[PDB]
Design an enzyme around this catalytic site. Structure first.
Site, mmCIF file in Angstrom:
data_model
loop_
_atom_site.group_PDB
_atom_site.id
_atom_site.type_symbol
_atom_site.label_atom_id
_atom_site.label_comp_id
_atom_site.label_asym_id
_atom_site.label_seq_id
_atom_site.Cartn_x
_atom_site.Cartn_y
_atom_site.Cartn_z
ATOM 1 N N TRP A 104 38.899 40.192 54.246
ATOM 2 C CA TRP A 104 37.576 39.630 53.978
ATOM 3 C C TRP A 104 37.645 38.378 53.091
ATOM 4 O O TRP A 104 37.196 38.347 51.935
ATOM 5 C CB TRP A 104 36.555 40.640 53.443
ATOM 6 C CG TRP A 104 35.211 40.006 53.539
ATOM 7 C CD1 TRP A 104 34.465 39.525 52.515
ATOM 8 C CD2 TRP A 104 34.493 39.681 54.743
ATOM 9 N NE1 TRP A 104 33.310 38.971 52.988
ATOM 10 C CE2 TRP A 104 33.302 39.049 54.354
ATOM 11 C CE3 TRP A 104 34.741 39.878 56.107
ATOM 12 C CZ2 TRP A 104 32.349 38.620 55.272
ATOM 13 C CZ3 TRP A 104 33.793 39.446 57.022
ATOM 14 C CH2 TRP A 104 32.612 38.827 56.599
ATOM 15 N N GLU B 91 44.899 43.379 45.815
ATOM 16 C CA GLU B 91 45.100 44.707 46.359
ATOM 17 C C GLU B 91 43.781 45.476 46.382
ATOM 18 O O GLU B 91 42.845 45.187 45.629
ATOM 19 C CB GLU B 91 46.157 45.444 45.527
ATOM 20 C CG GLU B 91 45.712 45.886 44.124
ATOM 21 C CD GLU B 91 45.518 44.743 43.127
ATOM 22 O OE1 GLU B 91 45.491 43.562 43.542
ATOM 23 O OE2 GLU B 91 45.385 45.035 41.916
ATOM 24 N N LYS C 186 32.201 39.047 40.796
ATOM 25 C CA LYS C 186 32.383 37.651 41.198
ATOM 26 C C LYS C 186 31.255 36.748 40.718
ATOM 27 O O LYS C 186 31.481 35.554 40.496
ATOM 28 C CB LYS C 186 32.538 37.536 42.719
ATOM 29 C CG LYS C 186 33.724 38.292 43.274
ATOM 30 C CD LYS C 186 33.729 38.294 44.784
ATOM 31 C CE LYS C 186 34.789 39.190 45.370
ATOM 32 N NZ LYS C 186 34.665 39.234 46.854
ATOM 33 N N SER D 130 32.743 44.017 44.222
ATOM 34 C CA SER D 130 32.724 42.562 44.230
ATOM 35 C C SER D 130 31.684 41.957 43.298
ATOM 36 O O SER D 130 31.650 40.715 43.174
ATOM 37 C CB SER D 130 32.469 42.006 45.643
ATOM 38 O OG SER D 130 33.544 42.224 46.558
ATOM 39 N N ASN E 99 37.101 37.405 49.191
ATOM 40 C CA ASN E 99 38.015 38.102 48.283
ATOM 41 C C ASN E 99 39.136 37.178 47.800
ATOM 42 O O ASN E 99 39.452 37.146 46.603
ATOM 43 C CB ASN E 99 38.569 39.341 48.980
ATOM 44 C CG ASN E 99 37.569 40.516 48.997
ATOM 45 O OD1 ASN E 99 36.724 40.661 48.107
ATOM 46 N ND2 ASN E 99 37.678 41.360 50.007
ATOM 47 N N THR F 244 30.555 46.189 47.273
ATOM 48 C CA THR F 244 30.735 47.371 48.105
ATOM 49 C C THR F 244 32.186 47.794 47.992
ATOM 50 O O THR F 244 33.073 46.973 48.213
ATOM 51 C CB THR F 244 30.420 47.051 49.579
ATOM 52 O OG1 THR F 244 29.167 46.356 49.693
ATOM 53 C CG2 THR F 244 30.357 48.329 50.399
ATOM 54 N N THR G 72 26.209 40.981 45.570
ATOM 55 C CA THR G 72 26.488 42.331 46.026
ATOM 56 C C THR G 72 27.889 42.802 45.650
ATOM 57 O O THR G 72 28.784 42.018 45.322
ATOM 58 C CB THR G 72 26.380 42.400 47.555
ATOM 59 O OG1 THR G 72 27.222 41.402 48.149
ATOM 60 C CG2 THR G 72 24.954 42.125 48.022
ATOM 61 N N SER H 22 31.110 36.712 49.355
ATOM 62 C CA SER H 22 31.994 37.685 48.735
ATOM 63 C C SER H 22 33.428 37.513 49.218
ATOM 64 O O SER H 22 34.116 38.474 49.542
ATOM 65 C CB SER H 22 31.515 39.120 48.928
ATOM 66 O OG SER H 22 31.939 39.895 47.823
#
Ligand SMILES: *C(=O)[C@@H](NC(=O)/C(=N\OC(C)(C)C(=O)O)c1csc(N)n1)[C@@H]1N=C(C(=O)O)C(=C)CS1
EC number: 3.5.2.6
Length: 270
Positions: A82, A145, A50, A47, A109, A214, A212, A107
């Protein structure tokens, strides 16, 4: 080279305890001194793309005065795992600025993929990064995806060094006009997802903005940040991890520890 790694730090032990690879680049913007460990290797962005996406939106808003306040409506098919902010505004829409803040600070999505569409997709974001001199960054996939992050796949990767250099240009340098620069900084400063990463190595009385990332699997997580120690020039740094085996866990504590070592290597008392 002159000012790189003037003071050695035990990154190798840290990554050996972690069971993977840690990539670090940190820049003291006052002196130009740097800390560098695996800094030119590629790591999955996850992420962390972003933050740069929000900066690209801001850059566009310099020419498109109405961009940030433009309302964006979206369907349920835009909501993916998320999406903590955009799911609350499904029935109302959100503005471009709100989507940007959600992507950076939670974050989110779904918000990120909506903004990627506005920019012309992964190639459009990559083009923005090329326009500021970053020849390393590559975004390849749309972000609806659950894209894999398997070892040796260069898609959707950059290096810690290129991340740090680009972040410096956008937050402290001249890549954005001053109002947009401060908005980018303010969004980073309001991030809520990084309290256990670089921020955990940064005293509470210093300002800090971060983004961040992950990924599921392969011990893959990251953070980049601008840090303003009081009374001296800001520091820009990036910490990326990955690990060789599918079930290897990522570690926020390892990211925080690597950030501490970077600050120590720069002689920053924290
Ligand atoms: C960005 O990094 C987002 N990450 C994800 O959507 C992925 N995984 O989420 C976790 C919770 C780690 C999972 O086990 O599925 C992902 C993206 S590409 C890939 N192979 N996996 C969001 N951002 C953050 C962050 O640190 O900012 C997260 C904690 C997870 S959601």
């Amino acid at each position: 080279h002159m000012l790189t790694n003037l003071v050695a730090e035990p990154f190798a032990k840290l990554e050996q305890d972690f069971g993977g690879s840690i990539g670090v680049y940190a820049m003291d913007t006052g002196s130009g001194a740097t800390v560098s460990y695996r800094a030119e290797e590629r790591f999955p962005l996850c992420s962390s793309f972003k933050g740069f996406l929000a900066a690209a939106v801001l850059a566009r808003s310099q020419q498109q005065a109405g961009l940030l306040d433009t309302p964006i409506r979206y369907g349920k098919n835009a909501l993916v795992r998320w999406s903590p902010i955009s799911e609350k505004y499904l029935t109302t829409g959100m503005t471009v600025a709100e989507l940007s803040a959600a992507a950076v600070q939670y974050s989110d999505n779904a918000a990120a993929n909506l903004l990627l569409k506005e920019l012309g997709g992964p190639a459009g974001l990559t083009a923005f990064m090329r326009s500021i001199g970053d020849t390393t960054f590559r975004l390849d996939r749309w972000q609806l995806e659950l894209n894999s992050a398997i070892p040796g796949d260069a898609r959707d990767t950059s290096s810690p060094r290129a991340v740090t250099e680009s972040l410096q240009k956008l937050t402290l340098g001249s890549a954005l006009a001053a109002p947009q620069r401060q908005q980018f900084v303010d969004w980073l400063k309001g991030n809520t997802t990084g309290n256990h990463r670089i921020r955990a190595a940064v005293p509470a009385d210093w300002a800090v903005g971060d983004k961040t990332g992950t990924c599921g699997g392969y011990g893959t997580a990251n953070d980049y940040a601008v840090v303003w120690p009081t009374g001296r020039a800001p520091i820009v740094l990036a910490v990326y991890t990955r690990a060789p085996n599918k079930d290897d866990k990522h570690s926020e504590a390892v990211i925080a520890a690597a950030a501490r070592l970077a600050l120590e290597g720069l002689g920053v008392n924290g």
